[PDB]
Design a protein around this ligand. Sequence first.
Ligand code: CL
Ligand code: CL
Length: 256
Amino acid sequence: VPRGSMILHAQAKHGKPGLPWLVFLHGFSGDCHEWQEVGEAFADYSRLYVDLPGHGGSAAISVDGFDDVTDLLRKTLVSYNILDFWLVGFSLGGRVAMMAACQGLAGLCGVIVEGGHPGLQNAEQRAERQRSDRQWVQRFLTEPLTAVFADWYQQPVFASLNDDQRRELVALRSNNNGATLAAMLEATSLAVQPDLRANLSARTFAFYYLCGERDSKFRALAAELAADCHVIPRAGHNAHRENPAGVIASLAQILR
Ligand SMILES: [Cl-]
Ligand SMILES: [Cl-]
């Protein structure tokens, strides 16, 4: 997909005529396949597996911030003539879903966020996240992805995984490019995101949170939100990966 393309790369699967679209957004280092094992259990719905800037088929697409991401995501929906849709976003894709929904997405039915940070409480928290993400960026601009992702999947957010799940994940995310990953990590960093709580509290849309039972970090952040939380048993931060069945049951509760 060209570097100057106005619409993001995505894989579409049509469903029943009367049903809305399920627009799936992956997390950092993922691609449009991420939500496919869970999404393909909702064959009645039309499904849109979007590749975010610096990821998958949208890897040549460089963005400055959430403003560019939202604009591109909006234009991508116009491309598939999507008028009624759900934004289902995981972690980074979760943050791009709340950031986009909060700045107007004509035709949104609701936003389903899985382990997506609503935003840091202040500028002091953001300044220290900038510091941290700049170190991460530097590793993605100098080391083989295999070596970077080994330490990536060792962060306290992934503590609940075993070495075999990590090795499987490290190998999968290596199928990327550190230069585009580092630009998208910097352009949509949590250090540049505002605290979206007051907007989510005054939201015009429907909002639903999913969390892995072992994801203590994002379970605590969800408790602060006036949205239903669906805690997924025997799963960590990536609940749709560890417990596809658990997450399918949560989506049915919400949609059907
Ligand atoms: Cl992951
Ligand atoms: Cl697994």
